[PDB]
Amino acid sequence: KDGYPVDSKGCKLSCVANNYCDNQCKMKKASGGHCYAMSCYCEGLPENAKVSDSATNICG
């Protein structure tokens, strides 16, 4: 799955840059990530870590 992980951060993270997401994604959350519309779109999660891809339905 791919999208924005939300749980511990609560409401998203306002990534400024792709690297700023990716470094945070790949370390734990996902296999990678990039910064989409100022939200860390993390890429390749385990299924337990639900994500959104629904254009900031979470209160980012």
PDB file with one MODEL, atoms N, CA, C and O in Angstrom:
MODEL        1
ATOM      1  N   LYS A   1       0.841  -1.185   0.000  1.00  0.00           N
ATOM      2  CA  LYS A   1       0.000   0.000   0.000  1.00  0.00           C
ATOM      3  C   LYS A   1       0.885   1.248   0.000  1.00  0.00           C
ATOM      4  O   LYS A   1       2.048   1.209   0.403  1.00  0.00           O
ATOM      5  N   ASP A   2       0.304   2.347  -0.460  1.00  0.00           N
ATOM      6  CA  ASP A   2       1.030   3.604  -0.527  1.00  0.00           C
ATOM      7  C   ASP A   2       0.073   4.756  -0.214  1.00  0.00           C
ATOM      8  O   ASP A   2      -1.100   4.733  -0.586  1.00  0.00           O
ATOM      9  N   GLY A   3       0.606   5.754   0.476  1.00  0.00           N
ATOM     10  CA  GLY A   3      -0.201   6.887   0.898  1.00  0.00           C
ATOM     11  C   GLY A   3       0.431   7.594   2.098  1.00  0.00           C
ATOM     12  O   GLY A   3       1.633   7.490   2.344  1.00  0.00           O
ATOM     13  N   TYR A   4      -0.408   8.310   2.832  1.00  0.00           N
ATOM     14  CA  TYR A   4       0.046   9.005   4.024  1.00  0.00           C
ATOM     15  C   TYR A   4      -0.250   8.186   5.282  1.00  0.00           C
ATOM     16  O   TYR A   4      -1.403   7.900   5.604  1.00  0.00           O
ATOM     17  N   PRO A   5       0.847   7.812   5.995  1.00  0.00           N
ATOM     18  CA  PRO A   5       0.714   7.191   7.303  1.00  0.00           C
ATOM     19  C   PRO A   5       0.334   8.226   8.364  1.00  0.00           C
ATOM     20  O   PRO A   5       0.943   9.291   8.468  1.00  0.00           O
ATOM     21  N   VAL A   6      -0.683   7.883   9.141  1.00  0.00           N
ATOM     22  CA  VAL A   6      -1.098   8.730  10.247  1.00  0.00           C
ATOM     23  C   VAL A   6      -1.427   7.854  11.458  1.00  0.00           C
ATOM     24  O   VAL A   6      -2.167   6.875  11.358  1.00  0.00           O
ATOM     25  N   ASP A   7      -0.860   8.233  12.594  1.00  0.00           N
ATOM     26  CA  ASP A   7      -1.130   7.531  13.837  1.00  0.00           C
ATOM     27  C   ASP A   7      -0.450   8.268  14.993  1.00  0.00           C
ATOM     28  O   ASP A   7      -1.104   8.889  15.830  1.00  0.00           O
ATOM     29  N   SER A   8       0.871   8.179  15.013  1.00  0.00           N
ATOM     30  CA  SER A   8       1.642   8.734  16.113  1.00  0.00           C
ATOM     31  C   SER A   8       1.788  10.246  15.939  1.00  0.00           C
ATOM     32  O   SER A   8       1.782  11.006  16.908  1.00  0.00           O
ATOM     33  N   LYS A   9       1.917  10.658  14.686  1.00  0.00           N
ATOM     34  CA  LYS A   9       2.028  12.071  14.370  1.00  0.00           C
ATOM     35  C   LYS A   9       0.645  12.719  14.452  1.00  0.00           C
ATOM     36  O   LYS A   9       0.514  13.936  14.582  1.00  0.00           O
ATOM     37  N   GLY A  10      -0.374  11.875  14.371  1.00  0.00           N
ATOM     38  CA  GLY A  10      -1.744  12.343  14.494  1.00  0.00           C
ATOM     39  C   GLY A  10      -2.293  12.792  13.137  1.00  0.00           C
ATOM     40  O   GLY A  10      -3.018  12.059  12.464  1.00  0.00           O
ATOM     41  N   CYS A  11      -1.927  14.009  12.761  1.00  0.00           N
ATOM     42  CA  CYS A  11      -2.413  14.586  11.520  1.00  0.00           C
ATOM     43  C   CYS A  11      -1.209  14.900  10.631  1.00  0.00           C
ATOM     44  O   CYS A  11      -0.752  16.040  10.549  1.00  0.00           O
ATOM     45  N   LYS A  12      -0.714  13.860   9.973  1.00  0.00           N
ATOM     46  CA  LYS A  12       0.116  14.048   8.794  1.00  0.00           C
ATOM     47  C   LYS A  12       1.462  14.641   9.212  1.00  0.00           C
ATOM     48  O   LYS A  12       1.727  14.859  10.395  1.00  0.00           O
ATOM     49  N   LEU A  13       2.297  14.893   8.215  1.00  0.00           N
ATOM     50  CA  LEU A  13       3.432  15.782   8.395  1.00  0.00           C
ATOM     51  C   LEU A  13       3.600  16.650   7.147  1.00  0.00           C
ATOM     52  O   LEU A  13       3.550  16.164   6.018  1.00  0.00           O
ATOM     53  N   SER A  14       3.798  17.938   7.384  1.00  0.00           N
ATOM     54  CA  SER A  14       3.935  18.887   6.291  1.00  0.00           C
ATOM     55  C   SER A  14       5.352  18.824   5.718  1.00  0.00           C
ATOM     56  O   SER A  14       6.200  19.668   6.009  1.00  0.00           O
ATOM     57  N   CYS A  15       5.581  17.807   4.900  1.00  0.00           N
ATOM     58  CA  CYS A  15       6.870  17.644   4.251  1.00  0.00           C
ATOM     59  C   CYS A  15       7.132  18.878   3.385  1.00  0.00           C
ATOM     60  O   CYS A  15       6.224  19.426   2.761  1.00  0.00           O
ATOM     61  N   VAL A  16       8.390  19.293   3.366  1.00  0.00           N
ATOM     62  CA  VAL A  16       8.781  20.462   2.597  1.00  0.00           C
ATOM     63  C   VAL A  16       9.391  20.011   1.268  1.00  0.00           C
ATOM     64  O   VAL A  16       9.519  20.792   0.324  1.00  0.00           O
ATOM     65  N   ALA A  17       9.760  18.740   1.223  1.00  0.00           N
ATOM     66  CA  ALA A  17      10.578  18.236   0.134  1.00  0.00           C
ATOM     67  C   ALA A  17      10.533  16.706   0.133  1.00  0.00           C
ATOM     68  O   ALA A  17      10.181  16.075   1.130  1.00  0.00           O
ATOM     69  N   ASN A  18      10.898  16.136  -1.006  1.00  0.00           N
ATOM     70  CA  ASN A  18      10.754  14.703  -1.204  1.00  0.00           C
ATOM     71  C   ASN A  18      11.696  13.964  -0.251  1.00  0.00           C
ATOM     72  O   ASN A  18      11.345  12.936   0.327  1.00  0.00           O
ATOM     73  N   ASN A  19      12.892  14.515  -0.108  1.00  0.00           N
ATOM     74  CA  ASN A  19      13.886  13.925   0.772  1.00  0.00           C
ATOM     75  C   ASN A  19      13.382  13.983   2.216  1.00  0.00           C
ATOM     76  O   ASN A  19      13.638  13.087   3.020  1.00  0.00           O
ATOM     77  N   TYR A  20      12.665  15.056   2.515  1.00  0.00           N
ATOM     78  CA  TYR A  20      12.203  15.293   3.873  1.00  0.00           C
ATOM     79  C   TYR A  20      11.139  14.270   4.276  1.00  0.00           C
ATOM     80  O   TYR A  20      10.989  13.930   5.449  1.00  0.00           O
ATOM     81  N   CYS A  21      10.411  13.796   3.275  1.00  0.00           N
ATOM     82  CA  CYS A  21       9.481  12.698   3.482  1.00  0.00           C
ATOM     83  C   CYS A  21      10.281  11.395   3.535  1.00  0.00           C
ATOM     84  O   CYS A  21      10.185  10.623   4.489  1.00  0.00           O
ATOM     85  N   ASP A  22      11.066  11.177   2.490  1.00  0.00           N
ATOM     86  CA  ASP A  22      11.549   9.841   2.182  1.00  0.00           C
ATOM     87  C   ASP A  22      12.381   9.322   3.356  1.00  0.00           C
ATOM     88  O   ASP A  22      12.271   8.163   3.756  1.00  0.00           O
ATOM     89  N   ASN A  23      13.210  10.206   3.890  1.00  0.00           N
ATOM     90  CA  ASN A  23      14.120   9.831   4.958  1.00  0.00           C
ATOM     91  C   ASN A  23      13.310   9.367   6.172  1.00  0.00           C
ATOM     92  O   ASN A  23      13.751   8.522   6.951  1.00  0.00           O
ATOM     93  N   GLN A  24      12.123   9.941   6.305  1.00  0.00           N
ATOM     94  CA  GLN A  24      11.281   9.659   7.455  1.00  0.00           C
ATOM     95  C   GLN A  24      10.410   8.430   7.186  1.00  0.00           C
ATOM     96  O   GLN A  24      10.031   7.700   8.102  1.00  0.00           O
ATOM     97  N   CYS A  25      10.109   8.225   5.912  1.00  0.00           N
ATOM     98  CA  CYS A  25       9.257   7.118   5.513  1.00  0.00           C
ATOM     99  C   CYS A  25      10.055   5.821   5.663  1.00  0.00           C
ATOM    100  O   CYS A  25       9.633   4.883   6.340  1.00  0.00           O
ATOM    101  N   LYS A  26      11.211   5.797   5.016  1.00  0.00           N
ATOM    102  CA  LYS A  26      11.847   4.539   4.667  1.00  0.00           C
ATOM    103  C   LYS A  26      12.455   3.913   5.924  1.00  0.00           C
ATOM    104  O   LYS A  26      12.761   2.721   5.963  1.00  0.00           O
ATOM    105  N   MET A  27      12.619   4.747   6.940  1.00  0.00           N
ATOM    106  CA  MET A  27      13.354   4.343   8.128  1.00  0.00           C
ATOM    107  C   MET A  27      12.575   3.296   8.925  1.00  0.00           C
ATOM    108  O   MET A  27      13.143   2.533   9.706  1.00  0.00           O
ATOM    109  N   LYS A  28      11.269   3.282   8.705  1.00  0.00           N
ATOM    110  CA  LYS A  28      10.375   2.515   9.556  1.00  0.00           C
ATOM    111  C   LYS A  28       9.055   2.279   8.819  1.00  0.00           C
ATOM    112  O   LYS A  28       8.607   1.144   8.656  1.00  0.00           O
ATOM    113  N   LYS A  29       8.452   3.375   8.383  1.00  0.00           N
ATOM    114  CA  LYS A  29       7.061   3.348   7.965  1.00  0.00           C
ATOM    115  C   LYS A  29       6.919   2.448   6.736  1.00  0.00           C
ATOM    116  O   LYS A  29       6.006   1.628   6.645  1.00  0.00           O
ATOM    117  N   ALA A  30       7.844   2.624   5.804  1.00  0.00           N
ATOM    118  CA  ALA A  30       7.615   2.198   4.433  1.00  0.00           C
ATOM    119  C   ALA A  30       8.947   1.794   3.800  1.00  0.00           C
ATOM    120  O   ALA A  30       9.991   1.790   4.452  1.00  0.00           O
ATOM    121  N   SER A  31       8.880   1.459   2.520  1.00  0.00           N
ATOM    122  CA  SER A  31      10.082   1.152   1.763  1.00  0.00           C
ATOM    123  C   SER A  31      10.690   2.440   1.204  1.00  0.00           C
ATOM    124  O   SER A  31      11.902   2.548   1.016  1.00  0.00           O
ATOM    125  N   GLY A  32       9.819   3.406   0.948  1.00  0.00           N
ATOM    126  CA  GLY A  32      10.266   4.728   0.542  1.00  0.00           C
ATOM    127  C   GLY A  32       9.168   5.770   0.764  1.00  0.00           C
ATOM    128  O   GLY A  32       8.208   5.541   1.499  1.00  0.00           O
ATOM    129  N   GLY A  33       9.337   6.910   0.110  1.00  0.00           N
ATOM    130  CA  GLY A  33       8.291   7.917   0.080  1.00  0.00           C
ATOM    131  C   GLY A  33       8.709   9.116  -0.773  1.00  0.00           C
ATOM    132  O   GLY A  33       9.877   9.273  -1.129  1.00  0.00           O
ATOM    133  N   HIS A  34       7.728   9.950  -1.087  1.00  0.00           N
ATOM    134  CA  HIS A  34       8.012  11.281  -1.595  1.00  0.00           C
ATOM    135  C   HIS A  34       6.961  12.264  -1.075  1.00  0.00           C
ATOM    136  O   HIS A  34       6.007  11.882  -0.397  1.00  0.00           O
ATOM    137  N   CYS A  35       7.162  13.530  -1.409  1.00  0.00           N
ATOM    138  CA  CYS A  35       6.373  14.596  -0.817  1.00  0.00           C
ATOM    139  C   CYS A  35       5.322  15.039  -1.836  1.00  0.00           C
ATOM    140  O   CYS A  35       5.631  15.700  -2.828  1.00  0.00           O
ATOM    141  N   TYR A  36       4.083  14.659  -1.564  1.00  0.00           N
ATOM    142  CA  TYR A  36       2.985  14.992  -2.456  1.00  0.00           C
ATOM    143  C   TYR A  36       2.073  16.050  -1.831  1.00  0.00           C
ATOM    144  O   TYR A  36       1.541  15.870  -0.735  1.00  0.00           O
ATOM    145  N   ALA A  37       1.911  17.149  -2.554  1.00  0.00           N
ATOM    146  CA  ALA A  37       1.023  18.211  -2.114  1.00  0.00           C
ATOM    147  C   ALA A  37       1.218  18.443  -0.614  1.00  0.00           C
ATOM    148  O   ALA A  37       0.263  18.449   0.162  1.00  0.00           O
ATOM    149  N   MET A  38       2.473  18.634  -0.236  1.00  0.00           N
ATOM    150  CA  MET A  38       2.798  18.953   1.145  1.00  0.00           C
ATOM    151  C   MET A  38       2.217  17.909   2.100  1.00  0.00           C
ATOM    152  O   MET A  38       1.662  18.238   3.148  1.00  0.00           O
ATOM    153  N   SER A  39       2.362  16.651   1.709  1.00  0.00           N
ATOM    154  CA  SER A  39       2.086  15.549   2.616  1.00  0.00           C
ATOM    155  C   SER A  39       2.946  14.339   2.247  1.00  0.00           C
ATOM    156  O   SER A  39       3.089  13.988   1.075  1.00  0.00           O
ATOM    157  N   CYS A  40       3.509  13.718   3.272  1.00  0.00           N
ATOM    158  CA  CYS A  40       4.527  12.702   3.065  1.00  0.00           C
ATOM    159  C   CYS A  40       3.846  11.438   2.537  1.00  0.00           C
ATOM    160  O   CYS A  40       3.332  10.622   3.301  1.00  0.00           O
ATOM    161  N   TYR A  41       3.859  11.302   1.220  1.00  0.00           N
ATOM    162  CA  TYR A  41       3.324  10.110   0.584  1.00  0.00           C
ATOM    163  C   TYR A  41       4.328   8.958   0.647  1.00  0.00           C
ATOM    164  O   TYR A  41       5.222   8.839  -0.191  1.00  0.00           O
ATOM    165  N   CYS A  42       4.155   8.120   1.659  1.00  0.00           N
ATOM    166  CA  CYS A  42       5.090   7.034   1.900  1.00  0.00           C
ATOM    167  C   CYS A  42       4.653   5.830   1.063  1.00  0.00           C
ATOM    168  O   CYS A  42       3.474   5.661   0.750  1.00  0.00           O
ATOM    169  N   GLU A  43       5.631   5.006   0.714  1.00  0.00           N
ATOM    170  CA  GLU A  43       5.463   4.068  -0.382  1.00  0.00           C
ATOM    171  C   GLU A  43       5.907   2.668   0.044  1.00  0.00           C
ATOM    172  O   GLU A  43       7.050   2.453   0.449  1.00  0.00           O
ATOM    173  N   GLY A  44       4.976   1.729  -0.058  1.00  0.00           N
ATOM    174  CA  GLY A  44       5.264   0.348   0.288  1.00  0.00           C
ATOM    175  C   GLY A  44       5.208   0.138   1.802  1.00  0.00           C
ATOM    176  O   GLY A  44       6.225  -0.099   2.454  1.00  0.00           O
ATOM    177  N   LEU A  45       3.999   0.232   2.335  1.00  0.00           N
ATOM    178  CA  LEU A  45       3.783  -0.026   3.749  1.00  0.00           C
ATOM    179  C   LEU A  45       3.292  -1.464   3.931  1.00  0.00           C
ATOM    180  O   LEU A  45       2.779  -2.088   3.003  1.00  0.00           O
ATOM    181  N   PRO A  46       3.469  -1.979   5.178  1.00  0.00           N
ATOM    182  CA  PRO A  46       2.745  -3.162   5.609  1.00  0.00           C
ATOM    183  C   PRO A  46       1.284  -2.828   5.917  1.00  0.00           C
ATOM    184  O   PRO A  46       0.944  -1.695   6.257  1.00  0.00           O
ATOM    185  N   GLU A  47       0.439  -3.841   5.788  1.00  0.00           N
ATOM    186  CA  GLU A  47      -0.991  -3.612   5.670  1.00  0.00           C
ATOM    187  C   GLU A  47      -1.552  -3.063   6.983  1.00  0.00           C
ATOM    188  O   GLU A  47      -2.610  -2.435   7.015  1.00  0.00           O
ATOM    189  N   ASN A  48      -0.817  -3.318   8.056  1.00  0.00           N
ATOM    190  CA  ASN A  48      -1.262  -2.922   9.380  1.00  0.00           C
ATOM    191  C   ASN A  48      -1.238  -1.395   9.487  1.00  0.00           C
ATOM    192  O   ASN A  48      -2.028  -0.791  10.211  1.00  0.00           O
ATOM    193  N   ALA A  49      -0.314  -0.798   8.748  1.00  0.00           N
ATOM    194  CA  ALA A  49      -0.170   0.648   8.756  1.00  0.00           C
ATOM    195  C   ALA A  49      -1.068   1.252   7.676  1.00  0.00           C
ATOM    196  O   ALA A  49      -0.640   1.487   6.545  1.00  0.00           O
ATOM    197  N   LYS A  50      -2.314   1.495   8.054  1.00  0.00           N
ATOM    198  CA  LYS A  50      -3.284   2.050   7.125  1.00  0.00           C
ATOM    199  C   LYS A  50      -2.835   3.450   6.701  1.00  0.00           C
ATOM    200  O   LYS A  50      -2.156   4.158   7.445  1.00  0.00           O
ATOM    201  N   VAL A  51      -3.231   3.823   5.493  1.00  0.00           N
ATOM    202  CA  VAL A  51      -2.852   5.115   4.948  1.00  0.00           C
ATOM    203  C   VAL A  51      -4.069   5.762   4.284  1.00  0.00           C
ATOM    204  O   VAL A  51      -5.068   5.103   3.997  1.00  0.00           O
ATOM    205  N   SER A  52      -3.956   7.061   4.052  1.00  0.00           N
ATOM    206  CA  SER A  52      -4.872   7.744   3.155  1.00  0.00           C
ATOM    207  C   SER A  52      -4.191   8.007   1.811  1.00  0.00           C
ATOM    208  O   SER A  52      -2.969   8.125   1.724  1.00  0.00           O
ATOM    209  N   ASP A  53      -5.012   8.096   0.775  1.00  0.00           N
ATOM    210  CA  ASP A  53      -4.598   8.749  -0.456  1.00  0.00           C
ATOM    211  C   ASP A  53      -5.687   9.726  -0.902  1.00  0.00           C
ATOM    212  O   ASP A  53      -5.870   9.982  -2.092  1.00  0.00           O
ATOM    213  N   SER A  54      -6.399  10.258   0.082  1.00  0.00           N
ATOM    214  CA  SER A  54      -7.678  10.896  -0.181  1.00  0.00           C
ATOM    215  C   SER A  54      -7.574  12.400   0.076  1.00  0.00           C
ATOM    216  O   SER A  54      -8.466  13.012   0.664  1.00  0.00           O
ATOM    217  N   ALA A  55      -6.467  12.971  -0.378  1.00  0.00           N
ATOM    218  CA  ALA A  55      -6.385  14.411  -0.548  1.00  0.00           C
ATOM    219  C   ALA A  55      -6.697  15.098   0.784  1.00  0.00           C
ATOM    220  O   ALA A  55      -7.588  15.942   0.876  1.00  0.00           O
ATOM    221  N   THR A  56      -5.942  14.713   1.802  1.00  0.00           N
ATOM    222  CA  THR A  56      -5.964  15.434   3.064  1.00  0.00           C
ATOM    223  C   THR A  56      -7.368  15.408   3.669  1.00  0.00           C
ATOM    224  O   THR A  56      -7.954  16.447   3.972  1.00  0.00           O
ATOM    225  N   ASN A  57      -7.884  14.199   3.835  1.00  0.00           N
ATOM    226  CA  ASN A  57      -9.052  13.992   4.676  1.00  0.00           C
ATOM    227  C   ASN A  57      -8.639  14.082   6.146  1.00  0.00           C
ATOM    228  O   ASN A  57      -9.439  14.423   7.016  1.00  0.00           O
ATOM    229  N   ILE A  58      -7.376  13.768   6.393  1.00  0.00           N
ATOM    230  CA  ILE A  58      -6.799  13.966   7.712  1.00  0.00           C
ATOM    231  C   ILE A  58      -6.356  15.422   7.856  1.00  0.00           C
ATOM    232  O   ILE A  58      -6.049  16.099   6.874  1.00  0.00           O
ATOM    233  N   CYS A  59      -6.332  15.881   9.100  1.00  0.00           N
ATOM    234  CA  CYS A  59      -6.335  17.307   9.372  1.00  0.00           C
ATOM    235  C   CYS A  59      -4.893  17.813   9.302  1.00  0.00           C
ATOM    236  O   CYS A  59      -4.376  18.407  10.249  1.00  0.00           O
ATOM    237  N   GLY A  60      -4.267  17.562   8.161  1.00  0.00           N
ATOM    238  CA  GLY A  60      -2.862  17.891   7.992  1.00  0.00           C
ATOM    239  C   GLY A  60      -2.643  19.404   8.036  1.00  0.00           C
ATOM    240  O   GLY A  60      -1.509  19.868   7.909  1.00  0.00           O
TER     241      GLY A  60
ENDMDL
END
